[PDB]
Amino acid sequence: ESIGEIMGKLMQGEIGDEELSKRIKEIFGKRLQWGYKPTHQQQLAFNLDFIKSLKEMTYELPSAFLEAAFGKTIKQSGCYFKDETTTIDEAEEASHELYCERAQIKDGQTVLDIGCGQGGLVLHIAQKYKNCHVTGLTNSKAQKNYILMQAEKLQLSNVDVILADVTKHESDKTYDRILVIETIEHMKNIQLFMKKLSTWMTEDSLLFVDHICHKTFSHHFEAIDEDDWYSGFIFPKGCVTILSASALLYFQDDVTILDHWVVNGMHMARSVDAWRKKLDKNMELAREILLPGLGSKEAVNGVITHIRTFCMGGYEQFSYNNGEEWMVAQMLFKKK
Amino acid sequence: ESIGEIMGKLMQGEIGDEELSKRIKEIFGKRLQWGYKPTHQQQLAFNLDFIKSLKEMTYELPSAFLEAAFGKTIKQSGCYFKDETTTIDEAEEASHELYCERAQIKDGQTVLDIGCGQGGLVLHIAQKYKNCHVTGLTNSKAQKNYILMQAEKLQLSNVDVILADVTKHESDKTYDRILVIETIEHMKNIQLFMKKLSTWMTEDSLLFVDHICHKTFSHHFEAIDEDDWYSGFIFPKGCVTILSASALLYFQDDVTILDHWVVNGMHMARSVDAWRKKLDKNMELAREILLPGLGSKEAVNGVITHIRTFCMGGYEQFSYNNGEEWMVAQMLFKKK
Ligand SMILES: C[S@@+](CC[C@H](N)C(=O)[O-])C[C@H]1O[C@@H](n2cnc3c(N)ncnc32)[C@H](O)[C@@H]1O
Numbered sequence: 001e002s003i004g005e006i007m008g009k010l011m012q013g014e015i016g017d018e019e020l021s022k023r024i025k026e027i028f029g030k031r032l033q034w035g036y037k038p039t040h041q042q043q044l045a046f047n048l049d050f051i052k053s054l055k056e057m058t059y060e061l062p063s064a065f066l067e068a069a070f071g072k073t074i075k076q077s078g079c080y081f082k083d084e085t086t087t088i089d090e091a092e093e094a095s096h097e098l099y100c101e102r103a104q105i106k107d108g109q110t111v112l113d114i115g116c117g118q119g120g121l122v123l124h125i126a127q128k129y130k131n132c133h134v135t136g137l138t139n140s141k142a143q144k145n146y147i148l149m150q151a152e153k154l155q156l157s158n159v160d161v162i163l164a165d166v167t168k169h170e171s172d173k174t175y176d177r178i179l180v181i182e183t184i185e186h187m188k189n190i191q192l193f194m195k196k197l198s199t200w201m202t203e204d205s206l207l208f209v210d211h212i213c214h215k216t217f218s219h220h221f222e223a224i225d226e227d228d229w230y231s232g233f234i235f236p237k238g239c240v241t242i243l244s245a246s247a248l249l250y251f252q253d254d255v256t257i258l259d260h261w262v263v264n265g266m267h268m269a270r271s272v273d274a275w276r277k278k279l280d281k282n283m284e285l286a287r288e289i290l291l292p293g294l295g296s297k298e299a300v301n302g303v304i305t306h307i308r309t310f311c312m313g314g315y316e317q318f319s320y321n322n323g324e325e326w327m328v329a330q331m332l333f334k335k336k
Numbered sequence: 337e338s339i340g341e342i343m344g345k346l347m348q349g350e351i352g353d354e355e356l357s358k359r360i361k362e363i364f365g366k367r368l369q370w371g372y373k374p375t376h377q378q379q380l381a382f383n384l385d386f387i388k389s390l391k392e393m394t395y396e397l398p399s400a401f402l403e404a405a406f407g408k409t410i411k412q413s414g415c416y417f418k419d420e421t422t423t424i425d426e427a428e429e430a431s432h433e434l435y436c437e438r439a440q441i442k443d444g445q446t447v448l449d450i451g452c453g454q455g456g457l458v459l460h461i462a463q464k465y466k467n468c469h470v471t472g473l474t475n476s477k478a479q480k481n482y483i484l485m486q487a488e489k490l491q492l493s494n495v496d497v498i499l500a501d502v503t504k505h506e507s508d509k510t511y512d513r514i515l516v517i518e519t520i521e522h523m524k525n526i527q528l529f530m531k532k533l534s535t536w537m538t539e540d541s542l543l544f545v546d547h548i549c550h551k552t553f554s555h556h557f558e559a560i561d562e563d564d565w566y567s568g569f570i571f572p573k574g575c576v577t578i579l580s581a582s583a584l585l586y587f588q589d590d591v592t593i594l595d596h597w598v599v600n601g602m603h604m605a606r607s608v609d610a611w612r613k614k615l616d617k618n619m620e621l622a623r624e625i626l627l628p629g630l631g632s633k634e635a636v637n638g639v640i641t642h643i644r645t646f647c648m649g650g651y652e653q654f655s656y657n658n659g660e661e662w663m664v665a666q667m668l669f670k671k672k
């Protein structure tokens with residue numbers, strides 16, 4: 001059975017959830033076999049090769065659809081679930097709190113959020129710390145517009161948004177706190193990225209980075225073999241890197257580490273599960289929202305299949321071995 | 337059975353090798369239980385606590401005895417064994433070569449070897465690279481005297497030795513290459529140590545560090561519980577730290593990492609095994625050498641028991657799980 005066959009049945013909804021989960025789990029199993037080496041000597045050789053390799057390197061979903069699929073603040077990153085009964089809305093808030101603690105946010109600081117998405121964290125900080133000035137940076141005009149609208153509705157006067165590709169953005173402005181939440185995965189050139197960030201810091205600044213990781217090894221999000229239909233379906237563009245939990249320790253040319261944590265993968269698994277369940281509940285509504293801007297019911301079904309499969313696959317990835325394979329890494333840095 | 341009882345029988349040579357090895361292996365087993373955490377979240381918490389804690393912090397054996405126990409150049413660090421039949425002399429040379437490769441030694445460079453011991457590496461570099469100037473730094477007058485004598489005998493004109501406590505040594509001199517071979521384990525204040533080293537480097541310099549490690553966690557070389565008679569016998573002074581293989585990644589305030597390796601622990605195990613076997617072979621000779629400077633046969637037996645037990649214990653430590661627990665870590669750095 002080829003890619004085309006599985007992809008065919010997937011699109012027609014002919015693959016049940018049990019079989020889909022089983023197939024994706026097997027794909028991730030093969031990645032683990034690829035990544036784990038027999039000795040620490042070999043493991044480090046493998047990891048350092050990856051790190052050395054790094055040092056050499058328009059359609060948007062309507063907001064109404066996003067609101068039907070994601071939690072209240074449309075957080076598009078791993079959330080934090082205290083209980084089995086924690087709702088996605090509660091888990092978003094808990095994550096926001098966690099970032100504020102770990103990044104040592106204090107009232108009165110200037111804060112920059114890089115790749116701020118729909119601006120949940122920006123809005124959280126602005127509301128909690130009235131004397132902070134909070135800037136979001138996004139490459140999406142739609143996202144900028146959404147954040148500014150929300151700030152107006154929430155009577156916030158301390159929010160601004162920079163519309164820019166961060167890799168091209170030039171400014172002399174510095175910030176007390178820089179946050180990068182699950183954005184570094186998309187960065188083509190990390191050494192340059194960290195260098196740029198350092199130029200936006202003073203001696204008093206802190207930088208907080210959160211990224212999806214594997215505990216042991218790094219990998220690009222791409223197919224190992226021909227049997228992997230999943231990786232290329234989800235990200236048809238080789239633009240996602242999954243760093244090991246310790247990978248950023250090797251990128252301290254321009255910044256110095258102060259603290260380092262990981263969050264168990266079950267939190268991410270619970271996040272994607274919540275999105276999948278919410279999308280399922282609002283399926284009829286979702287199809288109606290998407291139809292105008294997509295043109296055909298066939299195109300709508302395609303977009304929905306893609307998002308739903310992402311969630312099903314994410315569940316298998318992050319829940320693997322009770323969250324002890326793929327997880328989230330967090331680091332705090334100061335400037336050199 | 338108390339410490340005193342086991343220590344009593346040990347001194348009398350009433351504990352056979354099989355029982356001694358078994359007892360020491362069990363002590364190391366308990367360290368592994370102490371060090372390994374159930375989740376990566378907990379593991380990182382444990383490791384970061386250790387790293388944070390660090391950031392807050394006359395009798396010498398005759399040379400004739402050392403020559404009877406150690407290899408030709410009296411290397412007192414892990415050696416590298418290609419074959420099962422590799423001799424300690426061959427393994428010393430192989431290690432020296434390995435350091436020269438990894439530290440990127442080139443003819444004409446100024447080289448500083450910190451805690452140079454009996455100067456095997458200093459002499460190796462001086463002989464192989466005639467245009468290099470090589471400086472050893474040691475806190476031992478006896479060691480300085482030995483190195484200078486050997487340099488004279490080998491017709492080397494490119495060797496000097498600094499007699500200093502490295503933690504107190506002040507100089508404006510800089511070096512193209514700084515080597516630290518199994519000396520950092522003895523350093524009370526590592527952050528300060530690395531800072532000092534950086535002041536002895538230029539933008540063109542490289543720093544190479546080699547240290548005994550555990551792959552996963554850090555620990556002081558000391559007793560966990562009352563059942564551990566071994567740790568305090570070997571090092572009656574809490575002056576030895578076993579860093580994790582990645583611990584130095586968190587000490588990049590003043591230097592930046594370029595490469596990182598580990599060497600499997602079986603090499604160290606083979607090293608201590610070779611020393612133990614050589615001491616055993618030259619036992620009668622060793623006792624005769626030690627007698628003058630120690631005063632009594634009882635004092636001689638004590639010193640020999642201590643060294644022999646160190647080797648027996650080292651074997652159990654480094655061979656644990658086929659060398660995949662305790663091993664040797666190596667790192668290459670440049671200056672900020
Ligand atoms: C996975 S989302 C995480 C969003 C947000 N931090 C959150 O936690 O919900 C990463 C974001 O980075 C943005 N992004 C990617 N590449 C970018 C670039 N070069 N410049 C600016 N933003 C970028 C994407 O548009 C996306 O919204």
Ligand SMILES: C[S@@+](CC[C@H](N)C(=O)[O-])C[C@H]1O[C@@H](n2cnc3c(N)ncnc32)[C@H](O)[C@@H]1O
Nearest residue numbers: 411412413451452453474475501502517519522
């Ligand atoms: C374990 S030996 C390794 C010796 C040598 N590098 C080798 O590979 O054989 C570490 C050496 O560091 C020396 N040392 C320890 N503390 C020192 C200090 N504060 N200043 C200078 N040397 C020191 C010890 O005397 C010892 O010879």
Ligand SMILES: COc1ccc(C[C@H]2c3cc(O)c(OC)cc3CCN2C)cc1O
Nearest residue numbers: 076077078181182183185212221240314317
């Ligand atoms: C469709 O839009 C998205 C919505 C939510 C996410 C969550 C998360 C994430 C989750 C995954 O499981 C994954 O696969 C390894 C990749 C990524 C990329 C980084 N990102 C923060 C990513 C998106 O692209």
Ligand SMILES: COc1ccc(C[C@H]2c3cc(O)c(OC)cc3CCN2C)cc1O
Nearest residue numbers: 412413414517518519521548557576650653
């Ligand atoms: C008696 O003099 C010594 C001779 C040889 C060594 C080898 C090695 C080493 C080997 C071990 O197995 C060990 O225990 C964990 C500690 C150490 C300290 C660092 N050092 C480089 C150390 C000595 O102190």
